[PDB]
Amino acid sequence: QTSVSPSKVILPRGGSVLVTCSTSCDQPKLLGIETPLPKKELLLPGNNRKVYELSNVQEDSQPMCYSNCPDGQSTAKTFLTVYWTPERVELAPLPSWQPVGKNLTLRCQVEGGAPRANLTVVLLRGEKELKREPAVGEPAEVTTTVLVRRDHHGANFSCRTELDLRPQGLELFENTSAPYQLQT
Amino acid sequence: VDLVFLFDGSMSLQPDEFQKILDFMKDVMKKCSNTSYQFAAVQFSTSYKTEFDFSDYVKRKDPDALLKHVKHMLLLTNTFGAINYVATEVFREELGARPDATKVLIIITDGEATDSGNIDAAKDIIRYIIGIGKHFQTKESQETLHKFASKPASEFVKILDTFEKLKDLCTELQKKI
Numbered sequence: 001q002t003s004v005s006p007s008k009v010i011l012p013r014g015g016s017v018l019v020t021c022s023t024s025c026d027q028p029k030l031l032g033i034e035t036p037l038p039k040k041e042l043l044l045p046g047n048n049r050k051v052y053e054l055s056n057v058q059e060d061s062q063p064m065c066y067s068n069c070p071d072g073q074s075t076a077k078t079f080l081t082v083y084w085t086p087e088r089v090e091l092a093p094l095p096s097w098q099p100v101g102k103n104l105t106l107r108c109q110v111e112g113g114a115p116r117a118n119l120t121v122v123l124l125r126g127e128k129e130l131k132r133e134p135a136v137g138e139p140a141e142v143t144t145t146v147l148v149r150r151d152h153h154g155a156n157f158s159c160r161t162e163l164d165l166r167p168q169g170l171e172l173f174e175n176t177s178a179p180y181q182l183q184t
Numbered sequence: 185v186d187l188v189f190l191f192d193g194s195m196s197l198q199p200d201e202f203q204k205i206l207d208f209m210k211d212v213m214k215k216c217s218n219t220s221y222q223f224a225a226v227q228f229s230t231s232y233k234t235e236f237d238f239s240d241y242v243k244r245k246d247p248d249a250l251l252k253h254v255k256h257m258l259l260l261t262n263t264f265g266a267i268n269y270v271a272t273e274v275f276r277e278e279l280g281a282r283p284d285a286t287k288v289l290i291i292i293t294d295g296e297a298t299d300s301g302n303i304d305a306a307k308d309i310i311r312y313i314i315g316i317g318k319h320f321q322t323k324e325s326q327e328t329l330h331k332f333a334s335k336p337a338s339e340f341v342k343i344l345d346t347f348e349k350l351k352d353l354c355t356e357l358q359k360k361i
């Protein structure tokens with residue numbers, strides 16, 4: 001007959017959260033939370049309701065509120081989601097000058113970033129989308145063979161990341177990378 | 185001596201601490217693979233299961249052949265009901281225990297109970313609880329590490345939140361072996 005809130009949460013590393021292990025029993029013999037995270041309990045007022053503070057959470061943890069009620073021990077599970085902007089989004093160095101009409105390769109790698117099912121990567125020669133693909137692995141390998149013709153005369157190529165937490169009230173967390181000074 | 189390892193497979197232990205625990209089990213077990221030395225293993229969380237019984241134990245003696253299908257459950261931590269499992273459904277002669285032998289109990293847990301039980305059902309067994317977490321700090325909350333204690337505050341409950349901070353417990357764990 002347990003219960004807990006909030007049921008879902010999204011937060012950055014090292015962040016802290018509060019959780020209320022509630023319960024509905026005539027007189028429960030025990031109430032607590034089950035987590036690998038550092039616990040710190042709150043107020044004394046109340047009996048069948050308990051609040052804590054899960055601190056310094058770095059991995060997507062999932063606390064578990066329990067309760068030994070006369071009827072029995074039940075469980076209420078919450079879900080902690082950690083999100084963060086990658087270490088480096090920079091792309092692989094090629095030299096400034098290049099022979100036109102060259103099927104040269106543009107490679108970009110991103111290391112980190114979560115939640116990984118929301119983080120996309122995009123290679124681009126200026127404000128033109130060259131290729132948008134989801135971050136795969138560590139670092140995230142991504143490549144698109146660019147040509148040297150007409151829009152190629154002394155351009156600047158770059159690599160950005162877009163982490164969409166907008167579907168859950170946050171913002172779009174993106175990071176641009178050091179430019180590619182292409183000349184010809 | 186029919187010794188038993190009772191390790192904590194609850195969520196509250198870092199996914200690593202599970203494997204750091206096993207290392208210790210082996211620090212005593214395989215190091216003391218000498219004959220006339222029987223062991224067992226019961227991972228406790230919200231539920232219980234005998235990881236490896238005596239029967240399959242003395243068949244392929246090695247802590248890398250008995251942990252074939254170990255799966256980290258990571259639920260609660262029924263510490264009491266765990267001890268009361270080693271008693272009733274573990275030390276039963278049926279499985280593979282020798283009568284004229286001392287029944288030891290090696291409990292491994294951060295010392296955080298998710299229930300309040302009673303171990304009088306096996307108060308005679310040689311207890312041996314080893315901390316490992318972070319929770320094992322203040323007396324106001326953490327005190328149950330004293331509940332399963334036997335003899336005076338000696339080498340029963342120390343700072344060893346990493347039992348790795350200890351050499352080979354062969355000639356050391358033989359307190360009556």
Ligand SMILES: *[C@@H]1O[C@H](CO)[C@@H](O[C@@H]2O[C@H](CO)[C@@H](O)[C@H](O)[C@H]2NC(C)=O)[C@H](O)[C@H]1NC(C)=O
Nearest residue numbers: 115116117118119120162163164165166167168
């Ligand atoms: C962020 O991650 C989730 C998880 O992949 C994206 O999609 C949903 O994921 C849940 C599981 O977490 C699935 O059960 C749903 O089927 C998914 N819903 C969808 C995508 O329709 C979520 O959309 C991601 N946000 C973005 C847009 O990247």
Ligand SMILES: *[C@@H]1O[C@H](CO)[C@@H](O[C@@H]2O[C@H](CO)[C@@H](O)[C@H](O)[C@H]2NC(C)=O)[C@H](O)[C@H]1NC(C)=O
Nearest residue numbers: 012084085086087088089171172173174175176
């Ligand atoms: C990636 O982008 C994020 C935001 O989109 C950056 O976060 C901010 O970083 C600056 C330093 O450049 C800090 O001063 C801000 O305080 C951060 N945001 C906040 C919490 O206000 C992040 O730094 C970028 N990553 C890199 C590698 O610099």
Ligand SMILES: *[C@@H]1O[C@H](CO)[C@@H](O)[C@H](O)[C@H]1NC(C)=O
Nearest residue numbers: 102103104105144145146147
């Ligand atoms: C040049 O680009 C084409 C475009 O699809 C690709 O098929 C080809 O393999 C590339 N050349 C290389 C690097 O072999």
Ligand SMILES: *[C@@H]1O[C@H](CO)[C@@H](O)[C@H](O)[C@H]1NC(C)=O
Nearest residue numbers: 154155156157179180181182
């Ligand atoms: C080219 O790269 C430089 C270096 O950051 C940048 O300042 C400039 O705006 C870019 N555009 C061009 C092609 O001049």
Ligand SMILES: [Mg+2]
Nearest residue numbers: 194196260261
């Ligand atoms: Mg636990």
